[PDB]
Design a protein around this ligand. Structure first.
Ligand SMILES: O=[As]c1ccccc1
Ligand SMILES: [Ca+2]
Length: 322
């Protein structure tokens, strides 16, 4: 748990924490959250929604969605609690909890999530149980506004699982069975509209049980945090138009966009046009200066890991580990 969060977690109602299923949805840098609308897919008892509530402040909004009666009944009955503790009155809540399938957010209950309404969509380990991954990615792209982002963690594999592994119940329930090969992930998400997938962090996932392991003998699984911006001008490739971006301060000593780009306070960093556009069209614009497009110079090479920046996801994931 990030230090900045511990105090806020100490304030969240014990019953929310005690009954929360799963690991926490990781959040972008806290400062970047101010005033954002954030949606948590598979929100459970609301741990992450309530943490976001505080961080987005009273101008922001937070939405939780889940299909477990159950955990939502608990989420819903602590809204006032948390408005008082964060904003001084039972009546100033900026959260709501919706009941529904995450693959169809338009029909969730009491109200749907409309088109182009969310700045950040977060989730941890919801995809590999999903019934249609494409439909989930398309629904995310729908609810995001331009410049918004899916900032999420899930389990992926370094190769395509066999049919026998995809059918196994214990593998399925551990979010391994339904894991995509990273490259299949990248095509699928692009088919949904996300043309540029940025690696934030990766951890190994191990199958130690030798019976399970025999179904997936040499497969390497990873827990990957990716960020996928919805920005109309992104291309499939990472092109140099001569630009530089400069982090102006305000949300930390330095801003780490992904594993290739870190921006120190007031130091110009050369960027590809995709990165320049993400910065310009997302909420991040508020803390950056981005220089104007020159003439095209070819593929972007002005990064000390440029070869990896252009390589398949597999290769990026495997080296950030090694
Ligand atoms: As989804 C998920 C991740 C780890 C273990 C069980 C389920
Ligand atoms: Ca969750």
């Amino acid at each position: 748990v990030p230090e900045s969060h511990r105090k806020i977690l100490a304030d969240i109602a014990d019953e929310v924490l005690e009954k929360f299923y799963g690991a926490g949805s990781t959040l972008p840098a806290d400062g970047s959250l101010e005033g954002a609308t954030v949606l948590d897919l598979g929100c459970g008892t609301g741990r992450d929604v309530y943490l976001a509530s505080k961080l987005v402040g009273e101008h922001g909004k937070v939405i939780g969605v889940d299909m477990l009666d159950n955990q939502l009944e608990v989420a819903r009955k602590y809204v006032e609690y948390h408005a008082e503790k964060f904003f001084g009155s039972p009546s100033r809540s900026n959260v709501r909890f919706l009941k529904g399938f995450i693959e169809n957010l338009a029909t969730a209950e009491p109200e749907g999530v409309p088109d182009s309404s969310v700045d950040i969509v977060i989730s941890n380990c919801v995809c590999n149980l999903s019934t249609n991954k494409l439909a989930l990615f398309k629904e995310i792209h729908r609810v995001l506004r331009d410049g918004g982002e899916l900032y999420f963690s899930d389990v992926y594999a370094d190769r395509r699982l066999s049919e026998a592994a995809q059918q196994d119940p214990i593998l399925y329930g551990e979010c391994l069975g339904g894991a995509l090969y990273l490259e299949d992930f990248r095509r699928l998400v692009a088919e949904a509209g996300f043309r540029d997938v940025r690696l934030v962090s990766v951890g190994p996932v191990d199958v130690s049980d030798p019976q399970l392991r025999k179904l997936v003998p040499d497969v390497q699984f990873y827990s990957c945090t990716f960020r996928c911006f919805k920005v109309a001008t992104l291309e499939a490739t990472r092109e140099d138009y001569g630009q530089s971006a400069t982090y102006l301060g305000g949300i930390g000593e330095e801003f780490k966009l992904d594993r290739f780009f870190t921006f120190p306070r007031e130091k110009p960093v050369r960027v590809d046009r995709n990165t320049a556009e993400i910065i310009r069209h997302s909420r991040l614009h508020q803390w950056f200066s981005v220089s104007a497009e020159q003439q095209h110079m070819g593929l972007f090479k002005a990064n000390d890991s440029y070869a990896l920046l252009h390589a398949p996801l597999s290769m990026q994931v495997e080296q950030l580990v090694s």
